[PDB]
Amino acid sequence: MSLLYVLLIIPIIGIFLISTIDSFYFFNVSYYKKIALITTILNLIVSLIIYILFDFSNNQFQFIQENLDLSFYDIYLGVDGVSIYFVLLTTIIMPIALVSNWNSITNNIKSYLIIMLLLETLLLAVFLVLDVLLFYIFFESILPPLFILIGLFGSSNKVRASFYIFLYTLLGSLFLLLSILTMSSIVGTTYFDVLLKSSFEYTTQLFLFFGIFIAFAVKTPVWGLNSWLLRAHVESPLGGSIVLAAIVLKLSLYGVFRLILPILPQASLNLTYIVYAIGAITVLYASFSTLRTVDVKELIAYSSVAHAAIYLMGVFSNTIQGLEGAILLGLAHGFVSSGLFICAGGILYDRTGTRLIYFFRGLTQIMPLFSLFFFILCLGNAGTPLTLNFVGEFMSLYGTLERLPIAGMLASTSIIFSAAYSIYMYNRIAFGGSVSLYFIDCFRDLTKREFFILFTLVSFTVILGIYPSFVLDGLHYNISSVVYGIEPNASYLT
Amino acid sequence: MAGLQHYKIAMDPALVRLGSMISNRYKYFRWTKRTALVSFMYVVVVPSTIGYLAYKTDGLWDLRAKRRGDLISER
Amino acid sequence: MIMISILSLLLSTSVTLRRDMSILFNRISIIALAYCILHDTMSLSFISKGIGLHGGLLHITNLTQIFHIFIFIISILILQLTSFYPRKVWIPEYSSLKDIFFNKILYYRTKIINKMGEHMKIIEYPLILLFVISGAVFLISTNDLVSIFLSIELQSYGLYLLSTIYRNSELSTTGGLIYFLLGGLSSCFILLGTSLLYVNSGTTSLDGLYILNSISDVNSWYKPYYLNFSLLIFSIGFLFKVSAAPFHFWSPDVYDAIPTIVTTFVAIIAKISIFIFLLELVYYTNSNANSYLSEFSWTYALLISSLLSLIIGTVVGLTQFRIKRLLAYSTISHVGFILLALSVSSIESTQAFIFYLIQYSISNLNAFFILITIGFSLYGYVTNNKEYKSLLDKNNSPIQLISQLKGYFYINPLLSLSLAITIFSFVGVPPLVGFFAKQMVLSAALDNGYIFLSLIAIITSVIGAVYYLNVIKEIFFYSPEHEVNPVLNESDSNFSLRILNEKNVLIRSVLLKGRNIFISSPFSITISIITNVILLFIFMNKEWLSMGTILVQILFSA
Amino acid sequence: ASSFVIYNISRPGPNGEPSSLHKWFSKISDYKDEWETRNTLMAAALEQAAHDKHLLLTAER
Amino acid sequence: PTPESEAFLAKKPQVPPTFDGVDYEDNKRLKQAQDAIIREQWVQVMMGRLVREELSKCYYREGVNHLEKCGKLRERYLQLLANAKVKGYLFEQQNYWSKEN
Amino acid sequence: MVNRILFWTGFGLAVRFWQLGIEMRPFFNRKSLWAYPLFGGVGASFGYWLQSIDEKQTKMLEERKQAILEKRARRAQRQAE
């Protein structure tokens, strides 16, 4: 059995144990949550073992299993450098997301844990499948559990949010599916090691680009196709929000490295100016509206839109540093947005029952531990150096600038505006007077649980902000394979 | 009110009512000369301007290893 | 075999007036269909595009025999609803294999199992069902214009009789009247089309019509406009019977008016037979060379109906609040997909067509079985809802409103999950069998240049997903309005169960409550198998998809 | 203190010779040609499978 | 010259960095070529990195006098900077070119 | 991993489990435990039978591929004139 199948199998086992342990012991729900948490820890331990064995400069897919039993739809699993870090992000985020909801899920706890465990398997399968149609199957599989997760555990507007995310993702994905089916018909399969050797003709590439781009712009999301996120990321339970912003936004980014860069190089280069205008517009518009957003969780949700615009522009840069910076930013966004959602949707929300900014002020006076982590997280959101967020923003922005200078210059303005909404939101909540007079009771500071999920997330962003080689070293060789172009005295050697 | 018991908050009805208006404002949008002009400016004009500028300057310049006796222009 | 079962069943039925025999007669109809499967299974050891039989009036193909068996298997599954009581008493002290085979349990069952329910007291119900099956098998196997007409009337007339067999229901008699009246109009179009074929060609043989068409497809005195024009009129009558738009209006009323158990058979069996029969007729009239004939091809009626069924089926379903009317509009939408695959005549589209029809029939079957089982599960529940209290024919159709499913996930979560899996398969969410079905039809349509229809299919699917999501929202997102009956479990209301051995000697007695009444095993097992087939298709797809691949390769074998 | 200790004991020593633990990690994750062998076998098999479907899907009516 | 390390040899390309006369149905041979083009680009790039390192030492060694004593490294680094770049294999895999054209 | 026998033995086990769950009956009471070897045994039988269908289907598809190539070849040789 492959280690990659073990990765997909462990959460299914935990689902089985959670659903059957009532027959061997009214079992306390603590037991259920213990099983699910240990299930995620083991999945993380396996991914760490894979990474220790993983080789940084191999262009062969690693840890694959021979099938020799070909069918119409066979799940082939494999890993390289451009997918190994997304697998690690998924297995680190999932335990933290479980602990972040340890107390706030009060009814239907078995259903909540089974959905999150199933989400872990499906999201991991997205990064590991070696077939383009397998990518769509896992990308779309997470929708029904996400629909149910929002509708069973969401806030007051959960129905409208659940419908929005389902119908937006489905609609975009249906245009991606038509693009994938055209590829499958021309080439005869969507297996990576066969399709990547195909050379689609330019007009085919253009109409293939449209349809894959429509889906990825719905999922990025670009501004104007992002109301599903402003609803779903806010109405979701806290664990749903962490998974939705840390891993689910990353699907469209990893999807660009498999579905556009190797097989649509000519359409990608010829259309980069359309991608860059949309990415530039998204960076400014999302930034200005974040500045005027009064729901604290909606403000953290809108800043995800602005950050994802920069990794999208870095992924179309066709430069090494822009592509590596895009992956670096994707990962750094996962730690920072997880921490800011915990701070808002899990610490403020649990204490007050409200998400309106008008009711918060001067929290530093009574919650020094919260304000310390909240501030460090707000510096990460502003891309402050010593966070992995600066390294990703700088490399992404440099590649975007070098590819198309006017687009990079506008995208660079994010260095001013991400600071503006991060510092503005930090000042209004932690600072900005004495403790808010709307609080009748005093508030306790972070519990040990809250401290150690914030500390862990803050630890990852700072350690990788100082030594980003821990990810870049395993990125360099594989990411070389998606660059398109030639030097005159370097090419066609004899 | 939302699962776990939270602390007592002096929930100010005016502020709560303002928060409700913001959540429901989409239900009351209408096409007027003002709203159409603003929407057209933000969605069409400004993006198409950046798109046109990005189009016209794509490939215009390269800085890498440019010395004196050379040009930044490539095209 | 099907003709012997009908005549033998009729003779036994003729000399009985005992209504307690209905459950036994239904069980025998299951045994009879199992033999029909055995005989047709033995008839699959040859390769041919077709062998004419019985003076050339009928024919057999590998495709014909496969769908004979499939019709029998769907009919055995539907026949369970009238062969077993809906609820059982189960206890953990009568669960061993020695208890089931050598011991017996005694208790007052009449009220619990609904022994004298309406669907348990119609003696001729399994017999009329067999008549419809004979109509359907004969139509698949028809080689001849007169055989077509006789077969379609035989299947149609039994369906009208099935829609009215609950003669004491005003709703049922109304739906039977509507079906017969508009179905009589559609039969006239079929007879008109068959008649115009005969008066122009001088032949009743389908072989002869295909030969005339084949010669006439060359690239002046008797230019053959009649064939496409006749089949156009012919096809419209068949579009009515599969309830394709714009000839769809009848089915949301009829399917809602007739009792739900009847709807299960009525809504599923007829589409299989007409679509399979249409497949061969589509293949053998396809003008290969682009001539004037292709300009007036009758198959554009299929493509227009496909377009209209995609739009009507999804848009009209948005504001449906009655659960059975929603399923009718959901079928019309899925018929639009089936019609698209049939209209594009390619190896890929025929594969897609064959797989789509079989997966859709098992899925629509799972939805009806879950709907019936939920209705029979409310036995020990009460509601004070005012809307539910004003429903008509509650016994015939226990669930009539989508709102009746509100909070059902809190009543029975795994049965609610099975419904949600089935509905998500209708949407086409991977990796459910419904996604792979939609994926195959889209592939073929795109590969043959049907892009505009491919795009309308994806856009309609998002609209259709809205009312599917609305059913799921009702089940999961709200608390239920049904409460367990206080008196069914009131801590002092125990009914007695005796456990006896093979010698009718009492072994033990036990006191029982409403909590010891369960869904009968035939329905739970059938839902469970089909739900797991929908869910786990990605690990089981090889042989099932290969069967359609081989069948199409035979049909196209140059 | 632990970081200082673990860094010191994990050094390759005065000469560029792997330690006892260094040789174990290199041995376990060797895969001298395993990935290439398996990857090549799978690529050719799905290549041929695409060939067969292309033959069946484009067969003359 | 510095001896080629045991680790280095384990990853040394056995094929020339080219796509000429490479059967794309041979999975092993195509991936070998791709690896050779990628590795060759990195070597040229890592060469510039070493020249830059030497230029750095002489600048801090010659101080005021760097404008006169560091020209040889200066020229070398600019030549590498003008020519070396990781461009990938995929344009050259999809586009054959001839000198005689 | 798609071993037919193990998969369909597992399928039968999942049918019994889902059925017990749908019936809201306990998943494991001792006197009912014979059902899992039964449902799994019936599942194993369905999959030995699917095994032999696959063998026939493969042979049929292999013969079809040769016929298409043979058809393609002769038509190509016919066009040589």
Ligand SMILES: CCCCCCCCCCCCCCCCCC(=O)OC[C@H](COP(=O)(O)OCCN)OC(=O)CCCCCCCCCCCCCCCCC
């Ligand atoms: C706002 C914060 C900003 C932070 C910026 C990040 C720091 C960069 C700027 C400061 C740079 C100084 C870093 C220290 C340089 C030397 C590291 C060192 O400790 O080396 C000693 C040890 C062995 O040396 P070795 O490499 O083996 O030499 C022989 C080689 N043949 O090598 C080792 O492996 C030992 C490693 C142990 C950890 C190094 C010591 C860290 C000291 C800083 C700690 C600050 C936090 C204090 C926490 C609370 C303490 C009360």
